[PDB]
Symmetry: D2
Subunit: 283 residues, 4 copies
Amino acid sequence: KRKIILDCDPGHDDAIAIMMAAKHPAIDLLGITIVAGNQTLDKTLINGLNVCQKLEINVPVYAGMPQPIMRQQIVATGLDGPVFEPLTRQAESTHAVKYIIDTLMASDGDITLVPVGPLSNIAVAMRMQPAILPKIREIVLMGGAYGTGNFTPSAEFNIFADPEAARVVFTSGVPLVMMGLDLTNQTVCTPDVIARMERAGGPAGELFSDPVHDATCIGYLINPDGIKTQEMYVEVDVNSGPCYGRTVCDELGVLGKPANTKVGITIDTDWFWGLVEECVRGY
Amino acid sequence: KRKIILDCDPGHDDAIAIMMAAKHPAIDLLGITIVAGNQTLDKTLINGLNVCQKLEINVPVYAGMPQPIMRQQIVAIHGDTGLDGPVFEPLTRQAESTHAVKYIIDTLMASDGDITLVPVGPLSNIAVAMRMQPAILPKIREIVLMGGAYGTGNFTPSAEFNIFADPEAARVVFTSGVPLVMMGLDLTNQTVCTPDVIARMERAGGPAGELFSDIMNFTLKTQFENYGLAGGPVHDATCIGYLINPDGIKTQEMYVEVDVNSGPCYGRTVCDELGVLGKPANTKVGITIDTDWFWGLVEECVRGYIK
Amino acid sequence: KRKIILDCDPGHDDAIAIMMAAKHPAIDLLGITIVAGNQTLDKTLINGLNVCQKLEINVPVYAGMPQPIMRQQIVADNIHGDTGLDGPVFEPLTRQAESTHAVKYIIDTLMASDGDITLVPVGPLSNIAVAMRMQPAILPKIREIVLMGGAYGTGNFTPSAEFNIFADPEAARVVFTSGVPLVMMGLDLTNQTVCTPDVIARMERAGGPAGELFSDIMNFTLKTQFENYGLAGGPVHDATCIGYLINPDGIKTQEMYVEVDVNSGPCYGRTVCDELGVLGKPANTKVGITIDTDWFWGLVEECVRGYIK
Amino acid sequence: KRKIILDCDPGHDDAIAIMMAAKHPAIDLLGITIVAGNQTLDKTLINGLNVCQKLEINVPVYAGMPQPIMRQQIVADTGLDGPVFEPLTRQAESTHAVKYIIDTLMASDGDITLVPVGPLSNIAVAMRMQPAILPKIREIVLMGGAYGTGNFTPSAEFNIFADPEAARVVFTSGVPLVMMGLDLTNQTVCTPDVIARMERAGGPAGELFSDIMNFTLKTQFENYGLAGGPVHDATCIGYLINPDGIKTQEMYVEVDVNSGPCYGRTVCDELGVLGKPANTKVGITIDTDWFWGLVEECVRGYI
Ligand SMILES: O=c1[nH]cnc2c1ncn2[C@@H]1O[C@H](CO)[C@@H](O)[C@H]1O
Ligand SMILES: O=c1[nH]cnc2c1ncn2[C@@H]1O[C@H](CO)[C@@H](O)[C@H]1O
Ligand SMILES: O=c1[nH]cnc2c1ncn2[C@@H]1O[C@H](CO)[C@@H](O)[C@H]1O
Ligand SMILES: O=c1[nH]cnc2c1ncn2[C@@H]1O[C@H](CO)[C@@H](O)[C@H]1O
Ligand SMILES: [Ca+2]
Ligand SMILES: [Ca+2]
Ligand SMILES: [Ca+2]
Ligand SMILES: [Ca+2]
């Protein structure tokens, strides 16, 4: 069992990630922290609460940063589709940043952080209490692209949305795994993938019905052998201009700097969609 | 009475600011938040606690950010402890458990909007609170900060130490839309504390006059070899002076922008003196201070501590 | 026949490009202008002159910019050796650079023209940016620019940047904002043209002075392109520009909005190419995607054999 | 006698610089090179020709760069309103300014000073086109930059802002530099009482000075709040005639080429906090009595 904290901005694929992480026996989901991203924090928080309520997930939810550490905010209800009953659960009182710090400090150094939105909560905690750093076993994140980005030619949305936060994470010295668009764009969810999930049915199959980037991070923790990675020296570009929020990945090793990231190259989509169905079934 | 939260990284002149703010009847000092800067947070916290203990100041002290929001940390001039000179009895005073950033947020949220923030170190605590809880922004009556320079910086030709130590944080503060007053190096360098000014405070005596001497006798050697100023300026204390009586300080309204480009102007406050950009002013920038009024004010506070 | 001015910094693959352009009946090679890049201008000029003398090419050679327009100079001795063209033997030079400066030659020749000359830059863009700014009126006179440079994916010299752009980004920023029709043969395309031992042996078989020069030349970079980037042979990057002019149907291109990054830092000299059109800006460049290597190596051989006596 | 090449974009104060350099026995004016700046090159050229024709100055004029080396062009209406000039009876040489600068320097004995008082496009193009001119240049005395507040932007003085990249080449060239920035040149404000003084000396140069400085009187005040058009460019000529009228301080200077709020800033290390060796003598103060006396002395040489 891998103990995780899932930090997220739901979010359609965030919702799938919550669904998988909460259900698989190889994941111990300690709690969910919410960050503004896909939509404003008031909205992402409600989406996150709704997902857990609908699926009857019993995991503490904590609200975190409603804004990036420095830049002017950008966004993508941020989860249109499924229909939700009136909301009967709320955020914990504790702020997400504090939760992350205290839980890591109290821990034995075996918790993995899994950020799949902009990195505001992670950067604030790291700088607020630098002593958490050797406590983090690993960070498996959804973000970046070694090739073309999405929001801009240069940048993937999660990094573009808080580049300065991303810079802190990438220079933290903690073990990093990056599932970027080069990998996650391979996990396109076509009508017959949806139909397959509908057929499995139950509350998770119906929610899935109403690409799937963030779920690959859970995938990777459940079984790293479905995903090929390559170690690289990665640097985050924080220049204003055409490459703001680019993750510059040194594929060929021409800078002669030691690798700081395992970067996602390819994913076995058969293994992966099998894993999604396996989780949909647990519900 | 102006309610303030004093955010600081003591620090020699920070200690002078603490001394003034805590004593003057025109200032209601709600609490002191500490930020890393002049020295690491472990050290600035102790220096802050030591000042308050020595002067028997009864105000809650909160530890905040031990690092800037993005850049690689730098420290200052102020020595190994960051407050060399005075000798302090063992510290029996302790920091609050609540983190400074939470303290700032909750206090502002609970308030009626008339608390002024007075940051005189790097702006890490301020930027984290503003982004953590954006709703504090209309609650802040004004920010009166020590930082920046429209002319020459000190740490680099372009940048003053407080801004240079966390430019990104500074950019957050300067784009917040909250009323800002900036006491930059252009103003604060006029407040050089020469041997006669020290001798004057020694003469007033008591615990605050002795501390003033011990502290400011150290930054006599150390502000000369670095910048060639007639003595240690008392930068941070001008913020308290501004609140006590704004008429002793001439300000000019300007459009101000913080440069976060890596390179020769990283952490520069770019001030539009002449209005060439056609942008509305966002800052009242310190131009000149009446040093006679000001040193008189310093003495007046020093004397409030004679038992 | 496409009239061209070939601007280059020879350079191993530059020499292959000179060999092809001078010989193919579909190309009218008006002149060769030289720029510092691969090596310093003193060296790239000699390498240029040696190639033409060896192959008995009768085309005026002009020396241009010995330095980039703004940045601190860099070379590629690592890829191209101490001389900038290690490999072949050359007899002492019995020819020399024209007296006219390359930049003036480019300007006057374009001004005097009927607007049908194509520029073919395959080194840093110093000569092209200086002419464009020195005489803005040349701009409508340029039919097209077909350049070797950039990369929409990974660069070579840095993770972000390909050498020709990296060596003068500001010059590049001039070219890419010029409004002249651009074709960019970047590393994404040109890395597909690796020259393995079998390709070399093919050209050796065709023989004559161009086949021998090809062999002497591409054996050097065979090993440096393997030591530095892990490539299977030394690509013939620059020759793809000539190839494109001889027959554009061997090369697949996609129109894109392209922008050169002049920020100091990790993306200095990156060509940022908007593959998916997310910026809603009109395309300014045809970007090389794929090359038919069978067509291309056949074309190389066809040129090599035009030199057998 | 100091041999000079005067590189300029006339320009009201450029014209005063042309007037002084051409007349003073301590200056040997070899030629005038023109750059786009104040106005487009077609305009700055004509202005430069008109000044020499009116004052009967017999010095070759050469047209140079019509555009900066990289950025989008900016200007500061003919570029020299005020004086009335007859129809032009002279023309520019045929040699391009950049080639002129290179050949003249290469042929020289290393005794020529360059005096740039517009954007640095001609200088940066020559330096990079023929790096061998560098040890040949005795000194560069330029009007440009500001260690304090700029004019065109809070950070940048016009000449640098108009071609920062060209400026970065000049400042990293290793050639001896003297910089007459706005911090110095703003002290040389030309008020109605200074104009009336030159009117009184009279002749063709006194009349031109009046017609010219009357225009800038209005447009310096509305734009920068100044008491009357400073005479920026003429200070470089002043500095060569007699350096003792001007106090300088040696500083490490760096040009900022970042896009953003400090594009085209000269960053001057006043206090030496970087620990880098100085590369520039920066103008601090000027004796305005000495200086105006010198202007009059030159105005008088034209009777
Ligand atoms: O179309 C979209 N617009 C904006 N954001 C998206 C879209 N699709 C996915 N994401 C969100 O951005 C991250 C990586 O791009 C993913 O984690 C996903 O939640
Ligand atoms: O010489 C110095 N170097 C760096 N920081 C300093 C120095 N003197 C004081 N401070 C601290 O930084 C701000 C002044 O710019 C002041 O807040 C002071 O506390
Ligand atoms: O692998 C390389 N690294 C750097 N420069 C190279 C390499 N191969 C060729 N060239 C030289 O630089 C340009 C293409 O990048 C080509 O124009 C060539 O002359
Ligand atoms: O008011 C003005 N705005 C902009 N440029 C000016 C002005 N007056 C003169 N110059 C031109 O710009 C340079 C220094 O700013 C001087 O060389 C001058 O010729
Ligand atoms: Ca997400
Ligand atoms: Ca302080
Ligand atoms: Ca080449
Ligand atoms: Ca001028």
